[PDB]
Structures are given as C-alpha cells and as structure tokens.
C-alpha cells in the first residue's frame, strides 16, 4: 500500500524519491497516520505534505525541523524512522505523541506545549550561528500556536535577530492545543511567504528549497494552508473531532464516541459552569484554545457572550480574566494544569496580587497520561499554591467541583483554582462528594474514618486514597482518608487534628512532591506537629517528568495509586 | 509653581486647566519632582502628555486607564489624587511605583510586570460589554511591553473580540519600559510596537507629547462612538521634558537621587557592586572561555548587569525584549543546539517564563542556566516585582537545579558548574542588591562547588539555620551572637534549594534539636523543600522542630527588602527571635 514509505526509514530515503513521488508518499503517510490513529489524526494529516516537503528539502537531523506542539509531526516521525513505532506512539514506553528531543535526532525540540517552536528555533538558529554552524532551522507552528504570546514575541525577536530559520505557519485555520494523542508579520521584519498550498507538496518542496537558504537576510515565515485532517475526508469535514479521534474505522470515519461513552471532568466543569452562568451574569468562562477540551463547547453555545477563546494564550486567558475580574466579573479560566503553567505569572501577578475574582477551572490536573511530561499538570498544586491568595482546590467529583465553582464565583476574596484531572468522575465504590451545595473553602472532608493513618488526598489522588483504603472501609476504617480537596488553603484544622492524633499521615496528590504534600508538611511544621511521633508519607508524582503513558501507569510508577498508598499504609 | 496644580484636586479640576495651562501643569510637575528630591522618571516624563490627555479625555475611574507595567503612570497617579503621595511612592506603607488597583480606583490594573495592560483592558472591555456597560477602556502600553507575547496575543484576541478598547502604544524611541527593578534597559531589541493582522484599529504614530493632539485623537477614538479596539501609537521621548532623562533614558529610567536643576545624580547606588554586576562580571568572564555561553535577557540587560556582557559578547547576548517566555524557550533552543544559554532575568519575571522553564527547558533537561536576579524581595517595586516564588516554582520542576549564591564567588562557582553541567538546567537566584565583588578568573572566582551541597558557614548543633543569599546573610547575622556564644546555632548556606543538600539537611536535622530554614522566598520554596526532604528522611527522624522563616504567602508591598524581610520574620532579629523560640 505504501511502497514509498516502506522504503523510507529516514529523510535520506525520502530524498531518494522524486518530488513527484512525494504526493504519493504523502498519501501513504496519511494512510499510515490514519491507521496509526485508527486504533484510538487531523493535525498530523493536515501537516503530512509539509513534513514531507521539509524532510525532502531539509537534511534533518543536521537541519532542524521543530514541530510546534509536535502533535502534527506523526508523518515527521514516520519519515524519521519511527513509522513502526507510531503504533506505540504516546503509549507507555513507546514514542512520544510529540517531537521529543530525547526520542529523536529529528525531534529538534521536545514539544507538547505550543508556540515554543519559534523561540526554540530561534534558539537553535542563534545557537548554530554562534557556533559558526550552518544548518537550517525550520519550525512548523500551527495557526493555533501562532496565537500564543510566546509565539508572537518569539517571532518578534526571530525577526529582530534576523537569523537563518524558516518558520512555517501551518494554517489549517484551527487553534490546536498542545496534547500528545488527543488534542503578514511585516513588523516582525520576517520574510513572509504565503499563504500557500500546505498540501501541494511539490510546491512546498520548491518553496522550502528556495526559502531555507535566503537565510542570509533572516527568517522566513512560510504560511502554508492546510486542511486539518487532509486526506481523511471525515477529518477534513470534522477536524475538531478528528484531530484527537478515538478508535475509528478508516473505511467509514466512524469512531468510538469516548466523549459520550464517558463523562469527563471537562464535562462536569462545563456543566457546572454552564449551569452557574445561567444564574450568574458576572460569570464569564475563558479558555485558552480549549472550548472543546475543558468541555465548554456547550458553555460557549449557551453563554457565547461570556465565553472567550484566547487561542493558545493561557497568559492572555488569565490576565483577561484579571481584567474581567477587575471589572467585577467572575471570570473563570478553563485551562489545563499543564497550560496554567503558561499563565503562571498571569495568575501570580495579573490575578493574585490584586486577589482578583479569577477562578481557574483546571483540567488535566496531575497526570494526563498520554500527553506525557509536556502535559502532566502535576505542578499547579505547587506553583499555584505558592501564590498568595490563590486558593487551590481539587474536587473529588462534580458535586465538589460545582461547590468549588460555586464558592469561587461567590467568594470575591481572591482567586480560586479547581484542579481536576484528565478523565471522568469515578465515584461508585469510593465516596464521591455532596450534591451541588457550596462547601467551606479550605475545609477538607473526611471520607473514611481512622486515626492511625490518614490519607490526605484529593481528586485523582483521593480516588487513589479511598481506593487504597477500600479494605480499611471493610475493616472498621482504621485508615482515614480525607478529601484534601483544598490544597490552598489546606484544611489546616483537619490537618492539625489528624496530625496531632495520628501516628502518621499519607499525603497524596496527583502532583509533584512539591505541592500538597509539601503544603501539608509545611502546615504541620507550622503547627509543630512534625514531631517524631507524627509521620507523613507524600505519595505523589516524583520530581521527574513523566513520560507519556496511562495516568494509571504513571501514578503507579509515581506510587500514588491505591496499591502504592496501600503499600505506604503497610509501611505505616 | 505648585499653586495651580495644588488647587487642582480632582480629574474635573485638571480638565478645568486646559490649553496654555498644560505647560504650567508640566512646570508644576517638574517643581514637585524637585521638591520630592530636596527633602528625602523617564517613562513617567515620557508619558505625561498621554496620561494628561487620557485623563483629560477619559472619565476615570469610570473609564479605565490601564498602565502597562504602571511605572510610567506617575503623572497618572499625580493626576488621580496621589501627587502628594509621589513622595512616598515605592516607599514602605506608601503608594506603589506602579498602578495598583488596590491603591486607586484610577489604577484600573495592578501592574509592574509588563504586557498585561492589553489583556487586562481586554478583560475590562469584555467585562463592561458583558455587563452591558459603556465606559471607555484604554491601556497604555510601551513598545517594550508590546514586545511581550502576552501583549501580542492579547492584542491578537483584542482584535478578535473587537471590543471597544484602546491601546496607546507608547514609546516611539521604542526604548524599553522602565522596570523599577531593572536598570539600563537600552540594548533591548524590544520594538514590536504593525497590527494589520491583529485587525485592530491603528492610529498614529502621533506625537505622544503633543498633548492637545493626544487629547484630540483620544476624543475621536475613545468615544463610545468608537467601536472596537484601537491602537494609538504615540511617540514619546523617554525622559521627556527632563533633558538629562531625554539624553539618557537608560539611566533616567530609574534615576537615583538627582538634582533637577543640574541632572547631577547619585550614581553611588549603581556604583555599588550589585549581584547584577557579579553575575554580569562572572558571565562576561565565563563567556570568554566558553563559546557555548550565550546570555539572554528579557529586556533587563541593564539590571541583569549584562550591558558589559552585551558589549563584550554581543554575539552571545540576546535581549528578547520583555519576553521572558521567549528568553527561556530561546535558551531552550540555544541549549538544544548544545549551547550553554543563560537566561538572565529576574525571579519575578521568571514567573512569566515559568512554563518555558518547565516545558521548554526542564523536560529535556536542557542546559538553560538561569541567572535569577531580583530573587526574593526586591523591596521598593513591591509585590509585582518580588521574586520570592522562584525557589518554589522552579523547585517543583524536575531537574531544575536551584541555587542561591551567598556572594559573587559562589555565584560564579554556581555559574561555572551550570555551564559545566550542560546536561540540565540550573537556576541561580540572587537578589536585587549587592554582595562582594570578587576577582575575575585571574583571582579564580571559578571556585569549584558541588552543586546541591550546602556549606556550613557557622558552627552549631543546637539550632541550624539553613538559608541562602539574602536569607543566609540573615541567618549569619542572626547568628552573629550565636557565634560569640560558642557557636551553638549553626548556619548553613543552603545555597542549593534544588537539589537540597539532603545529606547536610539530614545531618543537621538528626543532630539539631531544631532547625530554622530561611529563604528570601515564599513559604512554599526552600523551607517546603527542606521539610519535604526531612519528611522523606523520616528514615533519620527529620521530625525536628523546624522554623520556616521566610516571605509569607502574602504579596509584599513595596518597601526595603529589609523592611519586608523583617515583617516576613526572616531577618537576623527574627531568626534570632526564632532561635529564642527554639
């Protein structure tokens, strides 16, 4: 089916094609990408031709092709000797769902988060020039990634430093976020070439040949125009869906309706928020690029006058919420915890200094699994929690999430963060939450009795704690499990009470071991409860970035999953 | 001549003094500056006319005049009732040297970081529109603020949403906006200031000092009759109407004490050997012998000290403009290509690049060094500029080594290790302030240090004061007496916050009745790490009596670092009070 690609293990092999074969090769690549994604598309498909043209033209890994986000670089990987590893792309122990510098020499940059390619490529371009080297730099940034500030300033500087580099604007007219499986410029003083057919491969080859070496005059933006999902009609027709398509039949487009087959924390936040804004005209939702993936599609439909896609500009989303909140709105930045890091300062400075009524509904909090280390949102519990007046929450379920939403909208005290994972609300065997009644902010909830050992933890981590303590449920609840559904402030009182009465605690968070665990320990230290009588066992994400997997795999290896909490509890 | 503007008390009063009265107001402002100097600049002067025009045209605080960074808004504050509080601006318990929403109704936003005004004013514009309100929104943003991504994306979105709102692109010379904690920012290439693709109304460039024209422009754009977002490129000499400031907007950015009559200033403050100078000196020294070394700064070249570095190693110096995100990911790209890029940047501004550190650098463990100036309390630039968070936010980032040199020697050693340690990133956090100038490499300030390994600086086994940088100086100063008291209370240069000296922590932890940690950071940083390490070293009963003596989890208003530190209870006196509490 793919005779060209069968003889392509690398960009050299592609160059052994003729330009004419590249159209054939791209169809093959798209059919490979289709198949790769068929298991459970649009960005990579939309990028095939330019990937092909770039690897036909450019001499990676000598030349540097940087893929903003790297989600569209499936053909790039395929064409860089990772074709047969596409099957395990993003899978645990497999390749990344992005270009990953550690994965491939052809991966110039370790992307996931967007808009970095320009800056990275600028870095490379300068860094080459500094070393007196002379290889190309190419970035491929999506139009979505171009909306980001770091893209734009990077271009400002790229076009200020005037180095060899070829930005490609891959305009399929899609804001496409960072994720690893499931997702002119006049004043920049940059050459601008396009828009062009981002699927006329031979033309992209021709352009790329003729632009990459203009470089003595400085950088070029090659605006190409793609079709997201290109060469998969269904993906072309429904790029938003198909971009992160589930298991689909390449024959029919028909896919597994995971979204509907579940109910996500996105959905819950979305439902809670679309519910909230009905009764609250100050409520305004803001997503950076993620009306879909923070679930706000219905919100955007229902409250279009209160919905703000900033594109992939989390900083924007947050400081725009700061501005909304400054005008006495109740702006809610829907965003992932991984992307909240982009807005970090905007939280700190733009919001929290003035203790603004910015709520943050924080998806993908902790380990996102598949989206790997670029997208593991394990750090918000740390970084948000060091910000004065950033209240931080983690709902155990949609009820708590709503309550949390409902408090933050109602509490103009200061901003509130609500962190909840990529996934769906599991609350069957494990105790979930209330029903939709605003709780006391900062006040945890014991969900299991016990005074020997207390498993302070929240959201995904409380599911783990409760899961760990399941047997303790059945055994007179020796091990308490507290919904430490407030990371900021902590339930200092509950902490104090458990920590003064328990031989030990376990803290658990789907976060790095600088977050909640460190807060609990901080608070205990402040309470002087960190005597040798007291112990505390932080069972969390380690201080190592977490390569793509299942969250369960990663959490298991991190040792916060029920088994590992239980192993801690056996160590206790 | 105070009188005229002295009898002026409200925006209405200012409006009452219009044509052939603006000049008198300017003279009064100059006189006020002189009076402020006698007992006890550059953008504020450069922005007088725009501020005047904006307050003349716009009915703040009903209308919203936002000031990107907020530093240039001295006339704004002056003209919004804080004229007699300019004397106490940036002073402890006084007003912010930036617009601060909690300071004034007229401060529509709380700035000090750059590039926020657009996003903020967009938020205000939307928020108005959503509330069915109809007040003007205007932001004044410098071009230097404009170079930032957050500016640019916000404008991208501003022009996407097409709400009524106004951006006054300030700074024709394109000179970096005057950051209260940064210094000679003039070699910055921040000149984004054009917006066709932003779909924003664009007007100007206009004389940003022709006030009556600014008023005229402002009337005809920032009426409620104007739909959608407008950029008013004004053209504003930084230092305008102060010749010396106009001549040296780099210096008069943030001029020291000076005589209005003569421009003569106390270069003295800057004549101190700063941590900027040490980093700069170390780095300019390092890059001589290291061609992988590339310094990067986000428009802070003066106050990261890199003016000499840019001079000596222009081929390795990268002002990215006010684009810390850019600096860090660009350093990630340099670092990817096997450089040893060093993002010189302030800890407050490093927060901008936070993700870029996390994602762009640390996930690939890139050789991005960070020379984090303004670490901890910067003092008088207050909560918008206190870099007390790096010790927290960086320290949760896998493989982000974090240091704090106790002096230039340690800073060099630190620099010299991170350059050598090109398998990972390293942050070096040192305050706004001064230390000791060491000899160049001829005197071998390239002392080798073991990264991650603290240094006991004072003996003691009763109490151990783990601290670094400003906080070690506090610990050692706390332990001044302890020293004269048979050295009961050790002080450890906890000069590594990541990794900690787990071994030393452990060894002090298990031997001392008590610890103190001390950091010129929030009580989420070093202290939280120590206690996290003690937690994990419950193997060795890290369950000592620990005292985190640090910046509270409260944003700190502009003051002296020492005032703020004292109030934060990390200063020597407070550590000693802690030591008595131990």
Author numbering:
A (entry chain A): 73 to 112, 116 to 258, 320 to 708
B (entry chain B): 73 to 112, 116 to 268, 320 to 708
Paper text:
Small heat shock proteins (sHsps) represent a class of highly conserved molecular chaperones that prevent irreversible unfolding or aggregation of proteins under stress conditions to maintain protein homeostasis. In this work, we study Hsp21, a chloroplast-localized sHsp in all photosynthesizing plants that plays a critical role in chloroplast development, fruit maturation, thermomemory regulation and protection of the photosynthetic complex during heat stress. DXPS catalyzes the first and rate-limiting step of the methylerythritol 4-phosphate (MEP) pathway responsible for the synthesis of metabolic precursors for isoprenoids in plants. Here we show the formation of a stable complex between Arabidopsis thaliana plastid sHsp, Hsp21, and its natural substrate 1-deoxy-D-xylulose 5-phosphate synthase (DXPS) under heat stress, and report cryo-electron microscopy structures of Hsp21, DXPS and Hsp21-DXPS complex at near-atomic resolution.
Three-dimensional (3D) classification of the cryo-EM particle images identified subsets of unbound and Hsp21-bound DXPS particles, and the structures of free DXPS and the Hsp21-DXPS complex were determined to a global resolution of 4.0 Å and 3.7 Å, respectively. DXPS is a homodimer composed of three domains, with domain I being the most dynamic, indicated by the discontinued peripheral densities and the lower local resolution of this region. Each monomer adopts a distinct conformation, differentiated by the structures of the active sites located at the interfaces between domains I and II of the same monomers. DXPS catalyzes the oxidative decarboxylation of pyruvate to form 1-deoxy-D-xylulose 5-phosphate that requires opening and closing of its active sites. The density corresponding to the segment spanning residues 247–274, constituting part of the active site, is fully visible only in one of the monomers. This segment, previously reported to be flexible, likely undergoes disorder-to-order transition and acts as a gate to regulate substrate access to the active site. Moreover, the closed and open conformations resemble those observed in the pre- and post-decarboxylation states of Deinococcus radiodurans DXPS, respectively. Immediately after the segment 247–274, the density corresponding to a large surface loop of 52 residues long (residues 275–326), referred to as the mobile loop hereafter, is also missing in our structure due to flexibility. The final interface is defined by the interaction between the hydrophobic groove of the ACD of Hsp21 and residues 318–322 within the mobile loops of the DXPS. This segment spanning residues 318–322 in the mobile loop are disordered in the native DXPS but becomes ordered upon Hsp21 binding.
